[PDB]
Amino acid sequence: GTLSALAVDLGGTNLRVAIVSMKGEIVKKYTQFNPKTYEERINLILQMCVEAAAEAVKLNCRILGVGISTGGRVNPREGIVLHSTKLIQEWNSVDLRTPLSDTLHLPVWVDNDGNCAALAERKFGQGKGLENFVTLITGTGIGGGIIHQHELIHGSSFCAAELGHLVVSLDGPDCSCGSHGCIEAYASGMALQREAKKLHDEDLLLVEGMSAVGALHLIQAAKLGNAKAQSILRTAGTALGLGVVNILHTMNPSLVILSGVLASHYIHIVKDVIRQQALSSVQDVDVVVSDLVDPALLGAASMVLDYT
Amino acid sequence: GTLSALAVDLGGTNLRVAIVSMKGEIVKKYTQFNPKTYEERINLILQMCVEAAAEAVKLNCRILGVGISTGGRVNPREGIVLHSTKLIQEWNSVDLRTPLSDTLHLPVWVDNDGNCAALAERKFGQGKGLENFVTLITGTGIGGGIIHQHELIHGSSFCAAELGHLVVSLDGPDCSCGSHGCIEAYASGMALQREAKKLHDEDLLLVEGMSAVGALHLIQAAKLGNAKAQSILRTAGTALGLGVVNILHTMNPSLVILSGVLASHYIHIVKDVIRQQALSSVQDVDVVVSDLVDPALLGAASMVLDYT
Ligand SMILES: Nc1ncnc2c1ncn2[C@@H]1O[C@H](COP(=O)(O)OP(=O)(O)O)[C@@H](O)[C@H]1O
Ligand SMILES: Nc1ncnc2c1ncn2[C@@H]1O[C@H](COP(=O)(O)OP(=O)(O)O)[C@@H](O)[C@H]1O
Ligand SMILES: CC(=O)N[C@H]1[C@@H](O)[C@H](O)[C@@H](COP(=O)(O)O)O[C@@H]1O
Ligand SMILES: CC(=O)N[C@H]1[C@@H](O)[C@H](O)[C@@H](COP(=O)(O)O)O[C@@H]1O
Ligand SMILES: [Ca+2]
Ligand SMILES: [Ca+2]
Ligand SMILES: [Ca+2]
Ligand SMILES: [Ca+2]
Numbered sequence: 154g155t156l157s158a159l160a161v162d163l164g165g166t167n168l169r170v171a172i173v174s175m176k177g178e179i180v181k182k183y184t185q186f187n188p189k190t191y192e193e194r195i196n197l198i199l200q201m202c203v204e205a206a207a208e209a210v211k212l213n214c215r216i217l218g219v220g221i222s223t224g225g226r227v228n229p230r231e232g233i234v235l236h237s238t239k240l241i242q243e244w245n246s247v248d249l250r251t252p253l254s255d256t257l258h259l260p261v262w263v264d265n266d267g268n269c270a271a272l273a274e275r276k277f278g279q280g281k282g283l284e285n286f287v288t289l290i291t292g293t294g295i296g297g298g299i300i301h302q303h304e305l306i307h308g309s310s311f312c313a314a315e316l317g318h319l320v321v322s323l324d325g326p327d328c329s330c331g332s333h334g335c336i337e338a339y340a341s342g343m344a345l346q347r348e349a350k351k352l353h354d355e356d357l358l359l360v361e362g363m364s365a366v367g368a369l370h371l372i373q374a375a376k377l378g379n380a381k382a383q384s385i386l387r388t389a390g391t392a393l394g395l396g397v398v399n400i401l402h403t404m405n406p407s408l409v410i411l412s413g414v415l416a417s418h419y420i421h422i423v424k425d426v427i428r429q430q431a432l433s434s435v436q437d438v439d440v441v442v443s444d445l446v447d448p449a450l451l452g453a454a455s456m457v458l459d460y461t
Numbered sequence: 462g463t464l465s466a467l468a469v470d471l472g473g474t475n476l477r478v479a480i481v482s483m484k485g486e487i488v489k490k491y492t493q494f495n496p497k498t499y500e501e502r503i504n505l506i507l508q509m510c511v512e513a514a515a516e517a518v519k520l521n522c523r524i525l526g527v528g529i530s531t532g533g534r535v536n537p538r539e540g541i542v543l544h545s546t547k548l549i550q551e552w553n554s555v556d557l558r559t560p561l562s563d564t565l566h567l568p569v570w571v572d573n574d575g576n577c578a579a580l581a582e583r584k585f586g587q588g589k590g591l592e593n594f595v596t597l598i599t600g601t602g603i604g605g606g607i608i609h610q611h612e613l614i615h616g617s618s619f620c621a622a623e624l625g626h627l628v629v630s631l632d633g634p635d636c637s638c639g640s641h642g643c644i645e646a647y648a649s650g651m652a653l654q655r656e657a658k659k660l661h662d663e664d665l666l667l668v669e670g671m672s673a674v675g676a677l678h679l680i681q682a683a684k685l686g687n688a689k690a691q692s693i694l695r696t697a698g699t700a701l702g703l704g705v706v707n708i709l710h711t712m713n714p715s716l717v718i719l720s721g722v723l724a725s726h727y728i729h730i731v732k733d734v735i736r737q738q739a740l741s742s743v744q745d746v747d748v749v750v751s752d753l754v755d756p757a758l759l760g761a762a763s764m765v766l767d768y769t
């Protein structure tokens with residue numbers, strides 16, 4: 154009965170494991186915090202995979218393999234996480250294929266989470282049938298994935314599409330990658346979470362009709378007329394938009410898909426920045442918000458569904 | 462006798478026409494200022510091509526076709542300049558193939574000048590045999606060209622590799638494209654020409670051992686201990702370097718080739734900026750100065766030499 158993939162997504166905050174059908178339905182999803190150390194992370198990945206596999210049988214899903222989405226630079230051919238920013242600590246030169254395949258007796262695929270988001274958009278989303286498109290995924294950090302001639306660009310050292318580390322300032326705010334001025338350092342969930350705490354420190358966030366502060370408190374305060382939070386979100390969205398201009402002037406994709414919970418909040422500013430600053434010849438670019446609920450996780454599943 | 466191409470290069474300052482051998486030797490080169498209006502430009506292109514063709518016979522070169530390098534966005538399949546920044550005025554929706562082929566009775570190729578630079582580096586330079594590399598060409602403006610899987614990326618609307626309009630500031634100096642903060646607006650010949658005039662206005666450029674001010678006067682003054690010109694060149698080189706980081710984090714090429722007269726002056730700062738700010742996984746990138754005398758012109762010739 155139902156042909157399915159096991160999908161794993163390891164982000165800067167959450168570790169999720171899901172049973173996903175051929176058709177891109179999430180049958181069941183398990184969620185935990187991503188642990189901070191390697192030993193706990195690998196054990197929890199395995200514990201959650203074994204449990205999902207046992208539930209898949211009770212749900213009458215036939216698991217065909219495991220696909221893993223992860224932050225960090227990844228060698229997909231060897232199923233190895235090569236290097237991670239400190240958003241995921243202790244996550245360097247890690248062979249994920251061997252332990253998962255030995256424990257579960259399944260084939261294992263691995264890729265960067267932004268590259269998985271791209272794979273999801275190509276198979277189940279608005280990238281379907283397109284020769285070239287780019288996706289930018291806002292979560293804790295900002296991920297990217299690039300499709301060119303229908304296929305991912307991985308780069309000569311698996312570092313293509315690290316689009317959160319597009320730099321749009323000569324100075325600008327520090328990034329967790331160790332640089333500064335990265336679009337991630339302006340616009341990611343953790344960057345807005347930081348700015349929200351800053352405001353709230355000076356008691357300058359909460360406004361009439363409001364009450365773990367974070368991004369959505371900043372957005373909710375701007376909608377309700379807070380001038381300094383609007384400004385912060387404008388700077389953030391402008392930075393993201395300039396990151397998008399660089400992509401347009403680099404790859405010139407026909408479509409840019411923004412996903413993650415911040416996507417809806419940024420789209421209108423990104424389109425304004427393109428209009429105001431990009432070359433005329435890229436003005437026909439389509440910029441949309443993703444119609445998928447969890448691109449990374451669906452993308453991890455798509456590696457299994459397409460290549461098994 | 463000698464198999465050759467006619468090559469034309471139209472930049473922001475100069476219009477050059479050359480007879481180039483199979484082997485990438487420039488047999489003879491004619492140089493004029495690029496005119497400012499369409500009528501004069503097209504007439505001078507034709508006048509210089511007819512003359513070069515007549516000299517080729519006297520030099521015993523057999524011309525196989527004409528390749529044209531030009532600033533602006535170009536549809537190579539149709540031989541049409543689509544849109545140009547004001548660096549070349551009156552240079553929109555221009556069919557170059559028809560008039561050149563009717564007048565010279567030769568096949569005509571056309572591409573952006575940065576894309577031609579890439580073609581030159583792939584055939585005659587340090588891009589030979591490489592799956593992926595990028596070139597950035599500094600002249601009046603900054604051009605780019607991207608090779609991926611051995612071939613140019615032109616983009617879904619012929620605007621790929623407009624790398625001079627990578628943006629590395631939320632504000633920054635105005636660019637001739639109409640934006641601001643573009644690497645071209647910091648680091649191109651015309652941007653340094655502007656800063657040199659600024660210094661010299663405040664009588665603050667010339668130092669002991671010096672005497673149409675321009676980029677090389679700024680570089681020559683910094684070598685000789687002028688602190689404000691050093692600073693200007695540092696900001697310029699940092700901007701270019703951040704443009705390079707964006708490319709690395711986007712395409713992750715194995716090689717970046719800097720060309721044009723400013724290349725030697727920028728290389729050491731670009732490598733410093735990469736070292737200080739790019740992800741670890743792109744630190745093995747090779748960054749070199751081009752060994753070719755005129756990549757754009759040689760690239761225009763390479764379209765003829767390779768495809769005739
Ligand atoms: N209601 C919400 N839903 C999803 N993400 C949120 C929400 N509120 C804040 N966020 C931001 O997005 C992150 C959680 O989204 P997720 O895709 O799980 O992130 P990751 O890929 O970083 O694990 C949090 O770190 C937070 O910064
Ligand atoms: N000695 C030099 N040789 C080449 N280029 C120079 C020199 N001095 C300044 N330049 C800069 O480069 C431009 C000329 O180089 P070229 O490749 O002919 O430019 P373009 O492609 O803009 O015509 C000038 O606009 C100037 O800003
Ligand atoms: C561990 C690491 O190096 N992460 C970087 C990317 O590789 C990742 O794609 C992105 C999105 O992560 P998210 O926001 O947590 O989904 O974060 C960081 O920029
Ligand atoms: C006319 C026009 O739109 N030019 C733009 C590019 O297309 C061109 O590649 C570049 C290099 O020109 P150069 O410096 O004069 O060689 O200049 C501008 O950025
Ligand atoms: Ca830490
Ligand atoms: Ca990526
Ligand atoms: Ca003008
Ligand atoms: Ca170009």
Ligand SMILES: [Mg+2]
Nearest residue numbers: 162164292449
């Ligand atoms: Mg995630």
Ligand SMILES: [Mg+2]
Nearest residue numbers: 470472600757
């Ligand atoms: Mg030129």
Ligand SMILES: [Zn+2]
Nearest residue numbers: 318328330335
């Ligand atoms: Zn960064």
Ligand SMILES: [Zn+2]
Nearest residue numbers: 626636638643
């Ligand atoms: Zn510009």
